[PDB]
Design an enzyme around this catalytic site. Structure first.
Site, PDB file in Angstrom:
ATOM      1  N   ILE A  60     -12.623  28.685  -1.883  1.00 56.59           N
ATOM      2  CA  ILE A  60     -13.374  29.790  -1.303  1.00 56.59           C
ATOM      3  C   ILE A  60     -12.564  30.319  -0.123  1.00 56.59           C
ATOM      4  O   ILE A  60     -12.017  29.544   0.663  1.00 56.59           O
ATOM      5  CB  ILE A  60     -14.775  29.305  -0.845  1.00 56.59           C
ATOM      6  CG1 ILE A  60     -15.573  28.720  -2.023  1.00 56.59           C
ATOM      7  CG2 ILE A  60     -15.555  30.412  -0.149  1.00 56.59           C
ATOM      8  CD1 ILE A  60     -16.053  29.721  -3.045  1.00 56.59           C
ATOM      9  N   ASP A 150      -7.874  20.905  -0.909  1.00 56.04           N
ATOM     10  CA  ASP A 150      -6.726  20.826   0.020  1.00 56.04           C
ATOM     11  C   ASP A 150      -6.043  19.466  -0.065  1.00 56.04           C
ATOM     12  O   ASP A 150      -5.888  18.740   0.922  1.00 56.04           O
ATOM     13  CB  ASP A 150      -7.113  21.206   1.466  1.00 56.04           C
ATOM     14  CG  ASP A 150      -8.345  20.472   1.992  1.00 56.04           C
ATOM     15  OD1 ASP A 150      -9.138  19.923   1.204  1.00 56.04           O
ATOM     16  OD2 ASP A 150      -8.537  20.474   3.226  1.00 56.04           O
ATOM     17  N   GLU A 240     -21.221  15.155   3.192  1.00 56.34           N
ATOM     18  CA  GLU A 240     -20.794  13.744   3.208  1.00 56.34           C
ATOM     19  C   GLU A 240     -21.889  12.811   3.729  1.00 56.34           C
ATOM     20  O   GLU A 240     -22.061  11.698   3.219  1.00 56.34           O
ATOM     21  CB  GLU A 240     -19.535  13.571   4.044  1.00 56.34           C
ATOM     22  CG  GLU A 240     -18.961  12.168   4.057  1.00 56.34           C
ATOM     23  CD  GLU A 240     -17.607  12.164   4.704  1.00 56.34           C
ATOM     24  OE1 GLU A 240     -17.542  12.071   5.950  1.00 56.34           O
ATOM     25  OE2 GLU A 240     -16.610  12.315   3.969  1.00 56.34           O
TER      26      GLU A 240
HETATM   27  C1  LIG Z   1     -12.273   5.430  12.989  1.00 56.91           C
HETATM   28  C2  LIG Z   1     -10.783   5.303  12.851  1.00 56.91           C
HETATM   29  C3  LIG Z   1     -10.194   6.518  13.557  1.00 56.91           C
HETATM   30  C4  LIG Z   1      -9.465   7.402  12.522  1.00 56.91           C
HETATM   31  C5  LIG Z   1     -10.457   8.175  11.631  1.00 56.91           C
HETATM   32  C6  LIG Z   1      -9.670   8.990  10.602  1.00 56.91           C
HETATM   33  C7  LIG Z   1     -10.624   9.656   9.585  1.00 56.91           C
HETATM   34  C8  LIG Z   1     -11.241  10.904  10.133  1.00 56.91           C
HETATM   35  O1  LIG Z   1     -11.473  11.741   8.963  1.00 56.91           O
HETATM   36  C9  LIG Z   1     -12.642  12.559   9.060  1.00 56.91           C
HETATM   37  O2  LIG Z   1     -13.792  11.698   8.961  1.00 56.91           O
HETATM   38  C10 LIG Z   1     -15.019  12.431   9.101  1.00 56.91           C
HETATM   39  C11 LIG Z   1     -16.171  11.458   9.052  1.00 56.91           C
HETATM   40  O3  LIG Z   1     -16.045  10.633  10.222  1.00 56.91           O
HETATM   41  C12 LIG Z   1     -15.147  13.442   7.960  1.00 56.91           C
HETATM   42  O4  LIG Z   1     -15.146  12.763   6.687  1.00 56.91           O
HETATM   43  C13 LIG Z   1     -13.960  14.383   8.017  1.00 56.91           C
HETATM   44  O5  LIG Z   1     -14.001  15.294   6.923  1.00 56.91           O
HETATM   45  C14 LIG Z   1     -12.686  13.572   7.924  1.00 56.91           C
HETATM   46  O6  LIG Z   1     -11.593  14.479   8.048  1.00 56.91           O
HETATM   47  C15 LIG Z   1     -10.914  14.639   6.809  1.00 56.91           C
HETATM   48  O7  LIG Z   1     -10.188  13.552   6.210  1.00 56.91           O
HETATM   49  C16 LIG Z   1      -9.099  13.058   7.084  1.00 56.91           C
HETATM   50  C17 LIG Z   1      -8.495  11.820   6.432  1.00 56.91           C
HETATM   51  C18 LIG Z   1      -8.078  14.184   7.289  1.00 56.91           C
HETATM   52  O8  LIG Z   1      -7.427  14.477   6.061  1.00 56.91           O
HETATM   53  C19 LIG Z   1      -8.784  15.448   7.827  1.00 56.91           C
HETATM   54  O9  LIG Z   1      -7.837  16.523   7.898  1.00 56.91           O
HETATM   55  C20 LIG Z   1      -9.943  15.833   6.918  1.00 56.91           C
HETATM   56  O10 LIG Z   1     -10.612  16.998   7.440  1.00 56.91           O
HETATM   57  C1  LIG Z   2     -11.208  21.494   5.889  1.00 60.91           C
HETATM   58  C2  LIG Z   2     -12.516  21.734   5.144  1.00 60.91           C
HETATM   59  N1  LIG Z   2     -13.382  22.534   5.807  1.00 60.91           N
HETATM   60  N2  LIG Z   2     -14.343  22.798   5.442  1.00 60.91           N
HETATM   61  N3  LIG Z   2     -15.348  23.072   5.054  1.00 60.91           N
HETATM   62  C3  LIG Z   2     -12.772  21.022   3.765  1.00 60.91           C
HETATM   63  O1  LIG Z   2     -11.885  20.329   3.259  1.00 60.91           O
HETATM   64  N4  LIG Z   2     -13.942  21.232   3.133  1.00 60.91           N
HETATM   65  C4  LIG Z   2     -14.279  20.652   1.832  1.00 60.91           C
HETATM   66  C5  LIG Z   2     -13.942  21.636   0.706  1.00 60.91           C
HETATM   67  O2  LIG Z   2     -14.743  22.813   0.810  1.00 60.91           O
HETATM   68  C6  LIG Z   2     -13.987  23.889   0.217  1.00 60.91           C
HETATM   69  N5  LIG Z   2     -13.839  25.012   1.185  1.00 60.91           N
HETATM   70  C7  LIG Z   2     -14.173  24.884   2.550  1.00 60.91           C
HETATM   71  C8  LIG Z   2     -14.030  25.958   3.432  1.00 60.91           C
HETATM   72  C9  LIG Z   2     -13.552  27.170   2.941  1.00 60.91           C
HETATM   73  O3  LIG Z   2     -13.399  28.157   3.661  1.00 60.91           O
HETATM   74  N6  LIG Z   2     -13.231  27.269   1.592  1.00 60.91           N
HETATM   75  C10 LIG Z   2     -13.380  26.187   0.728  1.00 60.91           C
HETATM   76  O4  LIG Z   2     -13.086  26.315  -0.457  1.00 60.91           O
HETATM   77  C11 LIG Z   2     -12.631  23.307  -0.203  1.00 60.91           C
HETATM   78  O5  LIG Z   2     -12.687  22.832  -1.572  1.00 60.91           O
HETATM   79  C12 LIG Z   2     -12.516  22.165   0.737  1.00 60.91           C
HETATM   80  O6  LIG Z   2     -11.593  21.179   0.249  1.00 60.91           O
HETATM   81 MN   LIG Z   3     -10.347  19.415   4.146  1.00 63.86          MN
END
Ligand SMILES: CCCCCCCCO[C@@H]1O[C@H](CO)[C@H](O)[C@H](O)[C@H]1O[C@@H]1O[C@@H](C)[C@@H](O)[C@@H](O)[C@@H]1O
Ligand SMILES: C[C@H](N=[N+]=N)C(=O)NC[C@H]1O[C@@H](n2ccc(=O)[nH]c2=O)[C@H](O)[C@@H]1O
Ligand SMILES: [Mn+2]
Length: 282
Positions: A60, A150, A240
């Site tokens: 999106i 992504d 989530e």
């Molecule tokens: C505790 C140890 C400290 C380190 C913690 C590292 C994980 C943090 O992760 C985030 O966790 C959130 C929930 O708490 C959400 O799931 C978020 O989407 C996620 O970020 C995602 O996944 C991550 C792996 C990255 O890829 C980030 O870019 C994503 O948006």
């Molecule tokens: C960074 C991120 N953030 N948001 N929301 C994210 O990864 N969201 C989960 C998924 O939601 C979808 N998404 C999210 C935002 C957006 O503008 N477009 C989209 O496709 C993608 O498939 C993403 O992978």
């Molecule tokens: Mn993401």
């Protein structure tokens, strides 16, 4: 249908398949790590059922940019040899790249609306998956795999994951105690989980199962999010948080290790991960 004669190493009853990780949950669901499965046996079992796997992905607004690598790498690594149907949910039909697919694999573009807030785009995946579990998926596929866009595949993701209902261990928290899990902690939210409850912290970026079980999960999460919205609350980690509530109360029949959901930039490559299969684009 009987399996054909196969020659493979005998399972060793008195040798653990992994000595460093939990490979089965306390409700007897396998936890899928490299070394736990013989893919040749599993491929036979699932090919003899002519299994079709659907893969849903949302692209999106600006996230259409991630589709080319996502699909190209899925072609190399995702359910190769099996029937696959990609479902690309997008607000920009014309921005979907023309990726060359192997035989027995197809792609459908499903036009949907774009919400303004990224939180709503992420959350409304549950509604949209549930709706299409009626429009298309029940008639077209046996299993659904629902992932973030992504991302890229770097290694095998196959029929070892297939089961009525699965979640995936979030890469940030697989070694954390339950009190440290970022579950929704406000009792006012439908996603609320108390500090003394919880098995695992599942990642919203990778879940799936049979079409029937995915319909149930996604509708439950959507209906819970609508209750929260009516009560003026939004869960701390959106879809989530609700996924985690659902999987606490409805135990998954397999759990995928963080091999299946990883970020190498943030977390490196720990010894406990023999393979990095599906990884964040940095
Ligand atoms: C505790 C140890 C400290 C380190 C913690 C590292 C994980 C943090 O992760 C985030 O966790 C959130 C929930 O708490 C959400 O799931 C978020 O989407 C996620 O970020 C995602 O996944 C991550 C792996 C990255 O890829 C980030 O870019 C994503 O948006
Ligand atoms: C960074 C991120 N953030 N948001 N929301 C994210 O990864 N969201 C989960 C998924 O939601 C979808 N998404 C999210 C935002 C957006 O503008 N477009 C989209 O496709 C993608 O498939 C993403 O992978
Ligand atoms: Mn993401």
């Amino acid at each position: 249908v009987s399996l054909p004669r196969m020659v493979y190493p005998q399972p060793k009853v008195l040798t653990p398949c992994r000595k460093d990780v939990l490979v089965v949950t306390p409700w007897l669901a396998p936890i899928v790590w490299e070394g736990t499965f013989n893919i040749d046996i599993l491929n036979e079992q699932f090919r003899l059922q002519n299994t079709t796997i659907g893969l849903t992905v949302f692209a999106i607004k600006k996230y259409v940019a991630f589709l080319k690598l996502f699909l190209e790498t899925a072609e190399k690594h995702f359910m190769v040899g099996h029937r696959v149907h990609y479902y690309v949910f997008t607000d920009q039909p014309a921005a979907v790249p023309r990726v060359t697919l192997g035989t027995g694999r197809q792609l459908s573009v499903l036009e949907v609306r774009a919400y303004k807030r990224w939180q709503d785009v992420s959350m409304r995946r549950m509604e949209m998956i549930s709706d299409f579990c009626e429009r298309r998926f029940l008639s077209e596929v046996d299993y659904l795999v629902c992932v973030d866009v992504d991302m890229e595949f770097r290694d095998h993701v196959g029929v070892e994951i297939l089961t009525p209902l699965f979640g995936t261990l979030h890469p940030g928290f697989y070694g954390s105690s339950r009190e440290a899990f970022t579950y929704e902690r406000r009792p006012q939210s439908q996603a609320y989980i108390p500090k003394d409850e919880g098995d695992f912290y599942y990642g919203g970026a990778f879940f799936g199962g049979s079409v029937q079980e995915v319909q149930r999960l996604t509708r439950a999460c959507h209906q819970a999010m609508m209750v929260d919205q009516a009560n003026g609350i939004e869960a701390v980690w959106h879809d989530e948080s609700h996924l985690n509530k659902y999987l606490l109360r409805h135990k998954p029949t397999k759990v995928l290790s963080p091999e299946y959901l990883w970020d190498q930039q943030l977390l490196g490559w720990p010894a406990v991960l023999r393979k990095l299969r599906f990884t964040a684009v940095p």
